[PDB]
């Protein structure tokens, strides 16, 4: 075995029993991955100085009683993925100084766990995941008061008798993910701070009512369950995180301190007005992939602290969000909905909006003071705080002259809007602010914008368009990458794009009908600072 | 954090009444129950009651894997030909019992035994039937088949589970079936080499050993639970319902043996979302008045006899 | 109508369910060890056995209506009489049309025989279009009985084609089986004689009524890829399925499941597999593995 000062690290394979040739002064011993089929006390007892002992992933089945009692200084024992459940009553004797014990993967079952272990006064962490535990009887976690973290995921836990966690006053972390629980009738773990009940079959979740003591839960994960309702979390004031995603939660303060609510994939069709009041101080609200039809946050002071609002892939038809209501909203996701007509100043009233995704909708912009548009248009012309906008697949046929004249955004995407007739100077206000622009799949015949005039532009995309010539560059370009795939481009002379090479480092021309003879300087551009 | 203790049937029963009323109305294509008062009071006529009694009255594990094995028919050259050769209308498939018992060491283990034949005759329709060798002389009928013509060879499957089990437990050295042409009182295959064989399927000898989904009783009387007088027969029926939530059990490569049996009662079908649903149902015949003539009608899949997870 | 499915999660749920299902059906505590599996292909006999086992080999109510047999003394005794061989029955086809006017309305029809009282008797049911016609329907093995009992043959198609093109009088023949190398059973009406005679208990649709969602989804299972199992030798994965989709509140529908219905399989097909348990190979068949079609219940 490899040797280090006061530490022995036996390799993955090669040993059948615990070696007897190691120094008695060994303080750390690693034997994981080996064919050790048992732990007899005689060879192991020589190393009383052991503090860590990794027997993980061995074939151990029989532990001789008193084997781990002799190592008074042992602090961490790892028996993960062994064959303990095929056994040694009291196989693990008393463990006065063991701070961590890993038993996951052994396929321990209810009843054998209660006799396999012994007194462990100083146990801080216990891992029982990937076992065959089915029931948490009254007598499961006795004789370990100092436990602070308990791991029980990937088990088959269906039942939990009242008071199974009564012997764990200091527990702070309980992980019951990927278990078989089906209905939770109570919650009285005042000490607990993290609870993971995700990936279970829970149809209902309930807690204590009008308790005489406070609760310390801060992180509840109740997702991918069968929950049919939003749980009554009035007794959990300190909850900070809540992820009810992938449930069946139809909707018909308790959550004043919740900061991150994930309520997506929950068959929700309506958000009652009283609901959003309880979510004061919320900072993230994910309502994606619901059957929601309209968002009605018209009340002043609704969701004051919300920084993100995700409503993607709903059936949303209109937004009733009020002026100065979503004050702190930085990001608003709305892709995949059915927005057609809105009040012109819907998104302009969002005081601190920074990113707006409208892909897959069918909204139509308008230019405000320059070239006013029809009724029902949405006024992007004056969203001062906006910095990134997406209008992909909005079926916009005509873009107005003053579409973004007073919105200094940094990135704009208009891709896959077939037949987009860009009015001359439509993007005029973005010359000194925009850094990335995309117009892929528009099919437009000519660029109706002074593209070199965009001093701040860094990247551009014009792929899958009928374009034939580019506006004439005449100075050192701030552009860095330019994408021109599948277009009708025939020539790229220096008079048309010279000056790009000062900052350009990547180019795409494949699929275009370049003149085999007249391309000229294109071959030299391909030498350095170009590709394909 | 204790698990949910009990289920209140006093709500689910009424919620079943609500749905079964609608099912009764829908099965008869009725928007609302008909008016009962117009028809004069009196007994249902005797012939109609006889019809209603004719329809009412009676007339006349699989989850765990099964090891499959096959025993090939003896050669026709030595055991079969000498006394039961092939005739114009019959064939005789004989099997060795010693190797049959070798395939399945105990008769209790046998779950299924399919005698399989391959047919070369293609186009001529024929009626053929299967008999057991029952004694030194006699034969007993198993089953028959109508050979729908087809242009290509095809495999026939005859279920012989009971015969094969009887053969394992009491059979002699040599035994077999007769497959012969149908004929009345007033009036081919390979081997007669892909020859017929018995595809036995048995449990391996090494493997011989209010919450869960179940059917729960409910009796409905049309007069008081649904408040109906228009339905005259029967007075009520047992619309028992299924309850007991089936939890999804998250699998794992290494599982304790007594926990591997939890799948067979909570998720036998390996569904992504199991639910406790009816498995077996039988109809409810009724008599009722619309217009001025009684109507005897059969409503299908009304009673619940078993429930299963998905 | 409303649904919020994550198809990927449903698929992974079924993958991890197939893992546990395969391991539980075989009652394997853990995947079998491959440490002593012989090299090379499977034995010829094992592959032959695997191929041998692998190869292939209404909602709405019905109107109940009896129609009685013609009196045996009136139309049957003129040409046929009960004998040691067979009993003969005939029905007024005009009465059948009166009970059920058009073929498209019939759903089920069964000839309700009554046995007065003996010995294990094999009886078969024929057609009789005419005296020279022969057409078999079905048969039953009647065990000895201590009491009279009704017995029925499902005869739906014959009655439907009678309604389509039947004449005036036609019927059946009930014959004792003739092993090719006697009608001891006694029937009512061919000895009380005049009533409880054989009849058809027709089921039909009345004229006043006669006039994506849950479906099977495709999901291939590759043992070596998505489960990581090296111990299943054939098949190299099998073409399992699942099903999904909303069910509105259907041939076998009944709302007695819960407050909302479910999309569940109706037809499932077994999966034969071959694998090595230590040194020797074993061919097993697992039932209810491959989803073919699904109900709403």
Residue numbers in the entry:
A (entry chain I): 26 to 112, 116 to 280, 312 to 591
B (entry chain B): 1 to 60, 72 to 198, 206 to 210, 224 to 240, 261 to 361
C (entry chain A): 3 to 59, 73 to 132, 134 to 197, 202 to 211, 221 to 240, 262 to 299, 314 to 361
What does the paper say about this structure?
In addition, we determined a 3.0Å resolution structure of L-TGF-β1/GARP from the purified L-TGF-β1/GARP sample. In most of the structure, the resolution is sufficient to resolve sidechains for reliable atomic model building (left). The local resolution of the density map and the temperature-factor (B-factor) of individual residues obtained from real space refinement of the model are consistent. We further subject L-TGF-β1/GARP to 1 μs all-atom molecular dynamics simulations revealing clear correlation between the per-residue root-mean-square-fluctuation (RMSF) and B-factor. RMSF measures local structural flexibility and dynamics. Thus, local resolution or B-factor provides quantitative measurement of relative flexibility of specific regions, which clearly show half the straitjacket domain (including the lasso) is more flexible (enlarged view in the upper panel) than the analogous portion of the other straitjacket within the same L-TGF-β1. In the case of the fully latent L-TGF-β1, the straitjacket and lasso loops are relatively stable, as opposed to the partial latent L-TGF-β3, where the same domains are flexible.
